Paper text:
Class C Acinetobacter-derived cephalosporinases (ADCs) represent an important target for inhibition in the multidrug-resistant pathogen Acinetobacter baumannii. The class C Acinetobacter-derived cephalosporinases (ADCs) play a significant role in antibiotic resistance in A. baumannii. β-Lactamase-mediated resistance to β-lactams can be overcome using combination therapy involving a β-lactamase inhibitor coupled with a partner β-lactam antibiotic. Many ADC variants have emerged, and characterization of their structural and functional differences is essential. X-ray crystal structures of ADC variants in this study provide a structural context for substrate profile differences and show that the inhibitor adopts a similar conformation in all ADC variants, despite small changes near their active sites.
To assess the structural basis for inhibition by MB076, the X-ray crystal structures of ADC-7 and each of the variants were determined in complex with MB076 to resolutions ranging from 1.21–1.83 Å. Inhibition kinetics demonstrates that MB076 binds tightly to all ADC variants selected for this study and inhibits the turnover of nitrocefin. Continuous electron density was observed between the catalytic Ser64Oγ and the boron atom of the BATSI, suggesting the dative covalent bond that is formed with these transition-state analog inhibitors. The inhibitor binds to each of the ADCs in a similar conformation, maintaining key canonical interactions observed in other β-lactamase/BATSI complexes. The boronic acid moiety adopts the tetrahedral geometry formed by these transition-state analogs. The O1 hydroxyl group is bound in the oxyanion hole making hydrogen bonds with the main chain nitrogens of the catalytic serine (Ser64) and Ser318. The O2 hydroxyl forms hydrogen bonds with the side chain hydroxyl of Tyr150 and a water molecule that is commonly observed in BATSI complexes with class C β-lactamases. The R1 amide oxygens of MB076 make hydrogen bonding interactions with the side chains of conserved amide recognition residues Gln120 and Asn152, and the R1 amide nitrogen interacts with the main chain carbonyl oxygen of Ser318, similar to those made between class C β-lactamases and β-lactams. On the other side of the inhibitor, the R2 group orients the carboxylate group into a carboxylate binding region composed of Arg343 and Asn346.
Numbering used by the authors: 2 to 358
Amino acid sequence: TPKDQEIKKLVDQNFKPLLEKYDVPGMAVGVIQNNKKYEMYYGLQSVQDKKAVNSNTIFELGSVSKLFTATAGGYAKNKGKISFDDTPGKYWKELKNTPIDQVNLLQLATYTSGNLALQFPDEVQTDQQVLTFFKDWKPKNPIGEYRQYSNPSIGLFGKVVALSMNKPFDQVLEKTIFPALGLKHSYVNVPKTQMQNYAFGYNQENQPIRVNPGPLDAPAYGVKSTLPDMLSFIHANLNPQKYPTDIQRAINETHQGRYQVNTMYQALGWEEFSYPATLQTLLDSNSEQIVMKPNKVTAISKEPSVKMYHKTGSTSGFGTYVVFIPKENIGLVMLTNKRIPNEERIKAAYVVLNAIK
Ligand SMILES: *[B]([O])([O])[C]([C]N1[C]=C(C([O])=O)N=N1)[N]C(=O)[C]SC1=NN=C([N])S1
């Protein structure tokens, strides 16, 4: 049996059943193998409109947006606009000589400030309130020693990256990073002319919704993209030597592991693992303990010879999973317009990628 003919069958067997299981209106699953793209579309981007999911459908990426923030940081570092040893007050002058100005940019990007939780407080909304939050910040855990997964943390990193490139963060992605990556329909702000392609998300009561504005939302969870674009992004991560040298350096930078929390290596944005990874290793990265709680980190001891990378992302109405394995030249993207459990996304991708080899 010609093996490429099995990719569609494998994705049908492992991803399609999730639509009925979780009452998901629409899903887009892509595989890239040996530079060939496979795109599988299911269901509806809009229930009320009876509009089909296809290659023009725009989905919210949720925390997979952090991978573009990381790539923007790697790009600015290669242009010499920042050093990861700098502190945020070098760029956001109102933070200079405040306690947060003891945390360096790598520590912000990789969640080890020692006192930043997953979300800003609900009452922090305006730019002024965001600044006040960081000026009022005081340490808790020893800086650099504890990982607590955090939108404020990588959000501040993103704001600093934009300051170093003298452009607002949305313009850094839309005018510099996305074009260098060859993405055609990736947005921080979806323009009027693409709104008809923007899927509705659906909440747990199946009501149609889209992501709401929030503080430093764009660098933490505010990018929207299509399946073809996300496959191109995976392609760039699988083969950065084909891309312009500056974006090539940026991508490499996001692949470097910085520290570990047992079997999970924290890279810039990406989570990294020894390949082959056990299923439970991949599931653990999304455990309550790793996602919601502080964990003391360690230095990398085992430097994986062959690596794989992944990232989950969610908004209230959307689920995302991306995973790639350089030495197998394969990767996978899943986009849904209703959240489904992280472990389902990870497991389905594991079965598919293992069966293709
Ligand atoms: B990110 O996706 O990791 C991040 C945090 N997170 C984790 C999960 C999970 O485990 O299901 N869900 N969220 N995502 C966000 O912070 C999204 S914030 C918002 N999403 N929709 C809004 N209207 S605000």
